[PDB]
Structures are given as structure tokens and as C-alpha cells.
Amino acid sequence: MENFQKVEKIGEGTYGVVYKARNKLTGEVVALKKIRPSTAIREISLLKELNHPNIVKLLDVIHTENKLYLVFEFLHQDLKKFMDASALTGIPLPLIKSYLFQLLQGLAFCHSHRVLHRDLKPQNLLINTEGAIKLADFGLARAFGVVVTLWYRAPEILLGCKYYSTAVDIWSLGCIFAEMVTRRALFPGDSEIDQLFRIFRTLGTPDEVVWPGVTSMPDYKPSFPKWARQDFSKVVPPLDEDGRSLLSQMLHYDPNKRISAKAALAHPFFQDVTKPVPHLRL
Numbered sequence: 001m002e003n004f005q006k007v008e009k010i011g012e013g014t015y016g017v018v019y020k021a022r023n024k025l026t027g028e029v030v031a032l033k034k035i036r037p038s039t040a041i042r043e044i045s046l047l048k049e050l051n052h053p054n055i056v057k058l059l060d061v062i063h064t065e066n067k068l069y070l071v072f073e074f075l076h077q078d079l080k081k082f083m084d085a086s087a088l089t090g091i092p093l094p095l096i097k098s099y100l101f102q103l104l105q106g107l108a109f110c111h112s113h114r115v116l117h118r119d120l121k122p123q124n125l126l127i128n129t130e131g132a133i134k135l136a137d138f139g140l141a142r143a144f145g146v147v148v149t150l151w152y153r154a155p156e157i158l159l160g161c162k163y164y165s166t167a168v169d170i171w172s173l174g175c176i177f178a179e180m181v182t183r184r185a186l187f188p189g190d191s192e193i194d195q196l197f198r199i200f201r202t203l204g205t206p207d208e209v210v211w212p213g214v215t216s217m218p219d220y221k222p223s224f225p226k227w228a229r230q231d232f233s234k235v236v237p238p239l240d241e242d243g244r245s246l247l248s249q250m251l252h253y254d255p256n257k258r259i260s261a262k263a264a265l266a267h268p269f270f271q272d273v274t275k276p277v278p279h280l281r282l
């Protein structure tokens with residue numbers, strides 16, 4: 001832009017690049033995303049009215065010189081960096097719980113307003129010194145379509161469903177929750193099929209019993225290997241049983257059986273939730 005002083009590049013994405021920038025005028029520091037249609041307008045314009053404490057605020061939408069810029073409030077750090085920074089000791093469980101609870105609130109809000117994120121990953125969960133965490137980079141997916149991280153992709157997406165639901169965000173958040181707890185990505189695939197098979201190897205190859213309709217999925221192959229489900233206590237060993245029961249509900253194969261963000265918020269795991277302060281190195 002011209003009204004902004006690009007301080008530094010802070011993020012990448014399929015939909016563009018984000019820069020820490022200063023409003024040459026107001027002097028405010030923001031996150032400026034240069035986007036890489038009309039339905040895009042509605043879609044975006046909607047995002048502007050999608051305000052909640054756990055959703056990164058979209059401050060301005062600039063459509064000039066036939067280019068698209070999104071000005072977001074600047075958050076202090078991303079969860080990916082925080083997790084890496086906390087890898088020797090791990091993020092304290094109360095903070096993990098606080099983050100999960102807040103993200104579920106943000107998703108419950110998005111989903112009640114019929115907005116899907118579609119691409120949740122540690123890099124787009126942003127945190128501040130006050131202990132808040134917020135959803136960012138919705139990625140205005142469902143538009144510019146027709147390397148990329150597949151680790152958090154729901155199975156129905158991998159199997160070719162073209163009309164997936166809010167359940168895909170619960171899945172992604174479940175994966176992130178596991179990773180915060182174990183300090184290792186749950187399903188670190190490096191290809192769509194390896195992603196899919198890593199999920200199958202851990203949760204068991206889905207069948208009509210646990211996922212009615214799965215064998216009719218676009219990319220489902222009868223030739224898929226048949227793996228047994230692994231005992232969950234081996235999946236996320238440091239998580240207590242409440243945490244594990246919530247996680248299993250977030251990772252149900254059937255999108256229709258997968259817990260909703262609203263229902264997840266009432267789960268016993270959050271009975272003792274608090275809002276700790278993270279130790280951030282900025």
C-alpha cells in the first residue's frame with residue numbers, strides 16, 4: 001500500500017501475504033494482508049460484521065488499483081511460534097484448556113453465523129499478552145480455487161466431499177488440541193493419501209458402521225488398507241480422561257457425530273477452565 005509502511009512480513013498463505021504495517025497517518029500498527037469476483041465481496045463484507053473476542057477483527061477492506069487488501073488488528077504472536085517456543089516444557093494444561101475453550105467460543109460464534117473457517121492451523125490462531133487467542137485467516141476459502149499443510153484437514157475433505165460442514169473446523173481444532181498436549185503433530189501427513197492413511201492408522205480405517213456413507217465418498221477406495229483403531233490412551237497420553245473423551249468426540253469420523261463447538265463448550269473438561277497469562281517472548 002501507500003498509506004502503510006510495511007514493517008515486516010509475518011505470514012504466508014494460499015490467499016496472500018500478511019505484513020506487519022504502520023498506518024503512515026494514524027500510526028496504528030496493523031496486520032495488512034494483500035490478497036492473491038463479486039461473491040467475494042459479500043463473503044468478505046460479511047467477515048467485517050463478524051466481531052467476537054476470539055475472532056481477529058477485520059478493520060478495513062481496501063479495494064483499489066484493482067487489488068485487495070485486508071487490514072486486521074495486529075495480534076502479538078501466532079500459536080505455531082508459541083508452541084515451538086514452549087516445546088521443552090510444553091504449554092501448561094490450564095493455558096491449553098483456556099485456549100481450546102476460547103477457540104470453541106469463537107467457532108461456536110462463527111458457526112452460528114454460518115461461517116466456516118476451513119483451514120484452522122496453529123499458524124492462524126493468534127495470541128496476545130492478555131491470554132486471549134483468536135481465529136485468523138479464515139482464508140475466504142470457497143472462492144479463489146478451481147507448501148500447503150494438510151495436517152489438520154478433516155477426513156471428509158480428504159475423501160473428496162465438496163459440501164463439508166462446520167464439523168471440519170472441530171476436527172482441525174481437535175488436531176491442534178492434541179498437538180498442544182503432546183508437543184507433536186497428531187497426523188503429520190505429507191500428501192493427501194499419506195494424511196488420510198495416518199488418520200486411518202490411528203483412528204482405524206472407517207467403515208459403514210462408524211461412518212455411514214463413507215464407502216460412497218468420492219475418493220474412497222475399497223482397496224484402502226484396513227487398520228484397527230489404536231487405543232486412545234496411546235494417542236494423547238498426558239491428557240486426562242475428560243480431555244480424551246472431548247478429543248474423541250472432536251475426532252469422530254462421521255461429521256454428523258462429531259461434537260459441535262457449542263456442545264463442546266459444555267463438556268466436563270471445561271468445568272475448571274480459567275484464563276492464565278502466557279509467557280510471551282516478543
Ligand SMILES: NC(=O)c1sc(Nc2ccccc2)nc1N
Nearest residue numbers: 031072073074075076077078136
Ligand atoms: N494473519 C493475521 O491476520 C495476523 S498475523 C498477526 N501477528 C503476528 C505477530 C507475530 C508473529 C506472527 C503473527 N496479526 C494478525 N492479525
